Every structure is written in C-alpha cells, then in structure tokens.
Symmetry: D2
Subunit: 116 residues, 4 copies
C-alpha cells in the first residue's frame, strides 16, 4: 500500500509503481530531463518484510517506441512512511560507449521522491 | 543470446540471466558474500536496440525464503560482446536504516562479470 | 573571498576554509557524526579561474591528536555564489580494511554546505 | 616510503606523490586522458598510523598554465603494501555547470594504481 502509488522527484519526473506481495516492483517512469519522451517501463525489487526504512531499487532503460538514448539508470534507496512518505535514493546513469570512453560512462546523483 | 547466460563476478557470485526481446532482464543471483544463503530473484532492463557497449541494469533485494538482510543492490553498466564477453558495472547497496543512520546507508563499488 | 569562510552542512558539521590564489584549499573540519572528536586538517584544490559553478574538492583523513578512525572522506562538488552561497557535493568515505572486506569499504553520500 | 613514489593507473596516467610524516600527500598528476595537457598539482591526506589497508584520498583541479577544464576529481581509497603494492580507489569527477545541468555534473569510476 505504502510504496504503491504516484511519486514525483525534484526535477518534476513522475514514477507510477505497484508493489507485488512477492517483492516485485513494476510501473512506468515519466522523465522531465535528458534525451526523453513519453513513458518508459521500470522493474525493481523491494524488501517485502522490513524490520527503519524499507530497502528497494529499480531500473529504467531509456528506450521506448519513440526514442532510444542507449542508456539506463538504476535508483537504490529506502522508502520511509509517515505523514510525509518519501523515497530517498542515489542513482547511477550508464551510457553505452566505446571501450576508449568507458571510463566516463557513468553519472551518479541523488533524487528524493514525494508521494501524491 | 549475448546477455542471456551464466556469469560470475570477482567475488565468485553467480548471475543467471535471461534477456527478453523487449528489454526485460529476469533471473537469479547466488551470492558468495555478505549475510547470504541461497539464490535471490533479480529483475532489470537493457537496451534492446543498441547503437558501442549495451547499457543495462538490475536489482536484487536481499530477501529469500531463508534470510533477509533488509537491503538491496542495484548494478548499472554495459555488456561488451566478443570472444571474451564482459559486463562492467558499478553498484550501490542500500540498507534500510533509522533516520539517524541514513547518512551512511549506501555502499558503492564495482563488479566485472565474465563467463568463466 | 567567495569560498573562504565558515560553512555548515545538514548534519551540523563545520568546515573552515581559506582559498589561496594558487588554487589551494586549506582549513579544518569539525564533524558532528562518526567516530569523531575535535577538529581535523583538510586540504583540497579548486578552479581559481572559473567560467557556472566553481569546481572543487577536498579530503579529510579522520586522524587527529585524539582519535583515529582509520578512514578518509573526499567531497567533490561546486561552489555557487549569490545571495545564498552554497557548496553542493557528493562524497566517498573509505575505511581501511582487510582484503576480504575491501568490497564493502566505501560509502557514498551527498552534503550541502551553507555559508555563515 | 610505502606510499611515496611514482604510480600509474589503468589509463596510463602518472601519480607522483610524497607522503608526509604527519598525514599530508603532495605531488603532481599527469593525465593520459580528457581535456588534458601537462601536469597538475594534487593535495590529499592519509592515515599516518594505520591499524588492514591504509585509507587515503586526494584532489586534482584540472587547471594548469596551459588549460582549464573547469572540473576536479577526488580519489578515495586504500594503499595495500607488499611485494606487489597497490592503491585501489573510487573517484568522483565534478564539472562546474549551470544550475539546469547540475543534476548531471558528476561522473563516478574506479582506478587501480600500481608501480609498473
Ligand atoms: C528521457 C531521458 C532521461 C534521462 N535521465 N533521467 C534521469 C536520470 C537520473 C535521475 C532522474 C532522471 C529523470 O528523468 O527523473 C537520461 C536520457 C533520457 O533520454
Ligand atoms: C547475501 C548478501 C549479499 C550482499 N552483498 N552482495 C553484493 C553486493 C554488491 C555487489 C555484489 C554482491 C555479491 O553478493 O556479489 C549483501 C547482503 C546479503 O545478505
Ligand atoms: C569524526 C568522524 C566522521 C566521519 N564521517 N564524517 C562525514 C562523512 C561524510 C560526510 C560528512 C561527514 C561529517 O562529519 O560532516 C567518519 C569517522 C569519524 O571518526
Ligand atoms: C586532463 C583532464 C583529465 C580529466 N579526467 N581525468 C581522470 C578522471 C578520473 C580518473 C582518472 C583520470 C586521469 O586523467 O587519470 C578530466 C579533464 C581534464 O582536462
């Protein structure tokens, strides 16, 4: 119940997710930034029997029927319930590159999601 | 085909994956470290229409029928095919923590997977 | 002028720094968290001819005359001037470990400093 | 003695360092990549009274008499002595950016330094 719903980050992106009783996360991501357009499929996992926040993570490959950025982001973080539910994360964005450029293929950042 | 198979990291963990035509990664991860015991389920996404490496990412929540570490790792990287295929990644491992310990909830590292 | 001064982060730590005309950063760090006590020496570098924010970085090894945590943190970020001067960073904290534990030796986080 | 010397990473960059008795690292870094040309100054800190590896870290701002990339890298890691000594690190490279691009200002990677 907690995790399932609609969430937004500080860039204005939208994450719609359903938490399955088996630990699965499925939904769609709508990005406000990058070489973006329309929604993208996401998939992840979460601790379905937490103790503390609830550990979780998900991935988006930035390819849909309309655009392909040849890149993927993974967000790793924890869900914190309360009056104000939040998902605090750190993320890694890797771009497909040639061997010579691989050393500079990965960005790191942090995003905070607020539930709506 | 390329990504689909059994891979091993430097620690000796085993990543069994199936890459779907549509961009899904599904499979099992058997760890050689941490508060482990048995296999865990993973899910991810990948660029199913690459341009040089193939961007991808996946998540494992460290909970199975035997134990629960109340944490999850996300791996973000690229698959590089050829005679000696490899998946080069960076990872983030987040633990569920109290708010007071949240500043130190996330470890970062790098893993190289090969078929040997 | 800009960077030189006293700054605090969201954990309540204090950073006192002087920016030299040659790109050097020198000062002391006073930590609110960890296996801490008293102040620690810092040293870093910054872009002394920026374009955009000003790139910079610094290190603290958590050893003084009173305690030794056998660890060091590096903060990498940029200084942004204005009414409200800020230093936005991401950091890595590495602990000295045995070979068997090296894979889990490094934490990653983010800190925002406000000038006083 | 141990840390003091000339080291090389996987890219072929050269790190010339002097470790002070008190915990200071000082030296020069000559890059084999990026918007480079010549040597750059570095400064860092290290644990001068280790317990297994020796925690350390350093910064380079990418500005010299010839060019300025308006960025800086920080390396955080540990020195492991012996017959075949190594410095294993993770790094963060931050570029000075406008606020609109700040979300993607930081690259993350890993470097291994050896004496060969
Ligand atoms: C659409 C698109 C988005 C993109 N990075 N997105 C993100 C990355 C990290 C954190 C948040 C976002 C975010 O969108 O909220 C990169 C290429 C691209 O084509
Ligand atoms: C079994 C178990 C494993 C664990 N970290 N593993 C990893 C973390 C990062 C990269 C690789 C692994 C790897 O296993 O290959 C953390 C909790 C836990 O219960
Ligand atoms: C005193 C002490 C501090 C410590 N982490 N500090 C930090 C690490 C990352 C970001 C901010 C801090 C901060 O202090 O603002 C780790 C061991 C230790 O003995
Ligand atoms: C000369 C130059 C280099 C640069 N990144 N270098 C690096 C970054 C991370 C790790 C190693 C290096 C390395 O050189 O070993 C970025 C701007 C620039 O002008």
């Amino acid at each position: 119940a907690g995790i399932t719903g609609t969430w937004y980050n500080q860039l204005g992106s939208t994450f719609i997710v359903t938490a399955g009783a088996d630990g699965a996360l499925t939904g769609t991501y709508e990005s406000a930034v990058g070489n973006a357009e329309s929604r993208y499929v996401l998939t992840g996992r979460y601790d379905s029997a937490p103790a503390s926040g609830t550990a979780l993570g998900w991935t988006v490959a930035w390819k849909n029927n309309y655009r392909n950025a040849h890149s993927a982001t993974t967000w790793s973080g924890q869900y914190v319930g309360g009056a104000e539910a939040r998902i605090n994360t750190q993320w890694l964005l890797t771009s497909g590159t040639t061997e010579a450029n691989a050393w500079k293929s990965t960005l790191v950042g942090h995003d905070t999601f607020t539930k709506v």
